[PDB]
């Protein structure tokens, strides 16, 4: 089930405008219920893909944003509004490992997902994503503040070819990438 989300994740991705610089990169953020679960039992929370909404945003930014947007609040206070239920947990699918540090010095994504956990709401769990960031990792901060992460491996050369459309590297980038499995 996994891989079907990041082959949902890979779909949103390639709706993100190509530009020579961005990666284009889709999210899913799933209500899942605790235990032995159903898929079928899964609900879809919200999606999101690189540049979506205004500006320089990423696909994780968008999802938690369409939410908030949604709720009448700006995305930094959507963790007051995600549902937190005693019986289910947040997941998000991501193409690519959510992103540690930003060039722009824009909050990075791990930090959007880690601030989903305050007050009394459980926020985002765990990560699911297809690639590590090609090129202080992103999964080990999200380790550190304890969100559980996993790496769904076999999409690898898909996504990073969505990913890095837009660029003229992009033959040597995903090579590049492949080399480091
Ligand atoms: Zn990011």
């Known amino acids: 089930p996994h891989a079907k989300y990041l082959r949902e994740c890979l779909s949103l991705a390639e709706k993100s405008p190509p530009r020579p610089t961005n990666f284009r990169v889709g999210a899913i953020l799933v209500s899942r219920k ?9 609900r879809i929370v919200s999606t999101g893909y690189t540049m979506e909404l205004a500006g320089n945003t990423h696909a994780e930014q968008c999802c938690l944003s369409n939410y908030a947007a949604v709720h009448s609040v700006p995305e930094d206070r959507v963790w007051e509004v995600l549902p937190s239920e005693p019986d289910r947990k947040l ?6 490992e959510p992103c540690g540090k930003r060039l722009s010095g824009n909050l990075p994504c791990v930090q959007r997902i880690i601030r989903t956990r305050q007050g ?3 926020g985002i769990q765990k990560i699911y994503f297809g ?6 990792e992103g999964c080990q901060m999200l380790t550190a503040a304890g969100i559980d992460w996993q790496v769904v491996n076999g999409l690898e050369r898909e996504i990073l070819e969505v990913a890095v459309a837009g660029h003229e590297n992009r033959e040597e980038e995903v090579k590049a990438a492949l080399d480091t499995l």
């Open 131 to 136: 690639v590590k960031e090609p090129g202080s």
């Open 120 to 122: 009394d709401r459980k």
């Open 34 to 42: 605790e235990g032995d679960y159903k898929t079928e039992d899964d």
């Open 91 to 96: 997941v998000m699918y991501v193409t690519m």
